[PDB]
From a paper:
Monoclonal antibody IE-3 prevents mouse fertilization by binding ZP2, a major component of the oocyte-specific zona pellucida (ZP). We show that an IE-3-derived single-chain variable fragment (scFV) is sufficient for blocking fertilization in vitro and determine the structural basis of IE-3/ZP2 recognition. Among the monoclonal antibodies raised against ZP proteins, of particular interest is IE-3, which targets the N-terminal ZP-N1 domain of mouse ZP2 (mZP2-N1). This domain was suggested to directly mediate sperm binding to the ZP and implicated in the block to polyspermy by regulating the postfertilization cleavage of ZP2 (8).
To structurally investigate antibody–protein recognition, we coexpressed the unfused variable heavy and light chains of IE-3 (VH, VL) together with His-tagged mZP2-N1. This enabled efficient secretion and purification of the trimeric complex, which produced two crystal forms whose structures were determined to 1.5 Å and 2.1 Å resolution, respectively. The corresponding models are essentially identical (RMSD 0.28 Å) and their superposition onto the structure of the full N-terminal region of human ZP2 (hZP2 NTR) shows that, consistent with the ability of IE-3 to recognize ZP2 in native conditions, the VHVL heterodimer binds to the surface of ZP2-N1 opposite to its junction with the rest of the molecule. The three complementarity-determining regions of VH (CDR-H1/H2/H3), together with CDRs L1 and L3 of VL, generate a hydrophobic pocket where the fg loop of mZP2-N1 inserts. This dominates the interaction with IE-3, which includes only a few other contacts between the cd loop of mZP2-N1 and CDR-L1. Notably, the long fg loop of ZP2 is largely disordered in the structures of both unbound mZP2-N1 (13) and hZP2 NTR and becomes fixed upon interaction with the antibody. In agreement with this study, the structure of the complex and binding assays of point mutants show that hydrogen bonding of mZP2-N1 Y125 to CDR-H1 D52 and H54 is crucial for epitope recognition. Notably, the structure reveals that F-β-strand R115 and fg loop D122, two residues located outside the VxYK motif, also contribute to mZP2-N1 recognition by contacting CDR-L3 N119 and CDR-L1 R53, respectively. Most importantly, the mZP2-N1/IE-3 interaction indirectly depends on D127, which does not contact the antibody but orients R115 as well as influences the overall conformation of the fg loop by stabilizing a set of interactions centered around R124. Second, the high-resolution structural information on mZP2-N1/VHVL, reveals that the 3D conformation of the epitope contributes significantly to its high-affinity recognition by the antibody.
Author numbering:
A (entry chain L): 18 to 133
B (entry chain A): 37 to 138
C (entry chain H): 20 to 139
Write the structure that this text describes.
């Protein structure tokens, strides 16, 4: 719908070898930064087949407890990235960005991460 | 008619020659329903400082520093939310318009 | 310890309605939002709405207006989503997720999902 915050995620799919570093991009059509608390209202989720999505990152850069420090969220305003340094076989999943600054809440279309 | 997503606003909009005014229909606690003026991308306009007339409870915004100039006038983007919570997706978003003046 | 348990898979006919449940534990039920999310097979995630069980406030994605109805029961700490006028496009996995108001409503805990298939 018009006026909704659009999340444009890229690439749609990526193929990488174990140990390499990669970055996934999320662009917002609206600013997600709250001057009140100085936080970007953007989250990153990981979803493996047959499981529910897992919250990796909130406030665009703060890892959930137990999330390895090789997941790095960065960016501000409208431009955000999720970087995986030293990718591992257990990191194979679909990754989604989502904004929770404005209603309706919206997700990126997702990035499917593969090997080879 | 040209569609508008504006929810109800408990106030009255007056586009004066000097300024934009929003007269609130009742007095309320500004901390729990607080307006901020934002640009087209939703970022707060840091150069915008509005005034609150405490006698009649009226918000006053200057055209030059608090609105987005457009060909036919001025867009006024107001986000209102409870400042006692971190939950921003419950905020209300309003897009008002004032016509061009001399 | 925070857990969200959703009801089992549903297989129903077009035109009917279904009511799926999400029982929450490990946190103050009335303090947080409960969001619902739709996932069509292979088509990512789509936000449906949230309900605040504290006062039964709701907010809907307008795409799901009249399609989804959110309710909550405080005694059983259970949130229900009712989907009506089911069509083939409603076949999907539906998740509930806690909107943790301490952190701005971020969806930090999810149910296992409820598959709902609609076929004639």
């Amino acid at each position: 719908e018009t006026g909704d915050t659009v999340m444009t995620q890229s690439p749609s799919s990526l193929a990488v070898s174990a140990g390499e570093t990669l970055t996934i991009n999320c662009k917002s059509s609206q600013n997600l930064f709250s001057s009140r608390n100085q936080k970007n209202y953007l989250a990153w989720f990981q979803q493996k087949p047959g499981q529910s999505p897992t919250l990796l990152i909130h406030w665009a850069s703060t890892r959930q407890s137990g999330v390895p420090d090789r997941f790095i969220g960065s960016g501000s305003g409208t431009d955000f990235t999720l970087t995986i340094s030293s990718v591992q076989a257990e990191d194979l999943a679909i990754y989604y960005c989502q904004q929770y600054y404005n209603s309706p809440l919206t997700f990126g279309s997702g990035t499917k991460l593969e090997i080879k | 008619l040209p569609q508008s997503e504006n929810p109800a606003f408990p106030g009255t909009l007056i586009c004066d020659k000097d300024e934009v005014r929003i007269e609130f229909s009742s007095r309320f606690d500004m901390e729990k329903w607080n307006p901020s003026v934002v640009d087209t991308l939703g970022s707060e306009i840091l150069s915008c400082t509005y005034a609150l007339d405490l006698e009649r409870f009226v918000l006053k915004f200057p055209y030059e520093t608090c609105t987005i100039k457009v060909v036919g006038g001025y867009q006024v983007n107001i986000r209102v939310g409870d400042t006692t919570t971190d939950v921003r997706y419950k905020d209300d978003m309003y897009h008002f318009f004032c016509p061009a003046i001399q | 310890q925070v857990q969200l348990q959703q009801s089992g898979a549903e297989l129903v006919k077009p035109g009917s309605s279904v009511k799926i449940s999400c029982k929450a534990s490990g946190y103050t039920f009335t303090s947080d939002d409960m969001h619902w999310i739709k996932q069509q097979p292979g088509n990512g995630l789509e936000w449906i709405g949230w309900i605040y069980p504290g006062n039964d406030d709701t907010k809907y994605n307008q795409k799901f207006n009249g399609k989804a109805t959110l309710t909550a029961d405080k005694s059983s700490s259970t949130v229900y989503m009712q989907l009506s006028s089911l069509t083939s496009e409603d076949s999907a996995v539906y998740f509930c997720a806690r909107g943790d108001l301490n952190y701005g409503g971020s969806m930090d805990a999810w149910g296992q999902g409820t598959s709902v298939t609609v076929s004639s």
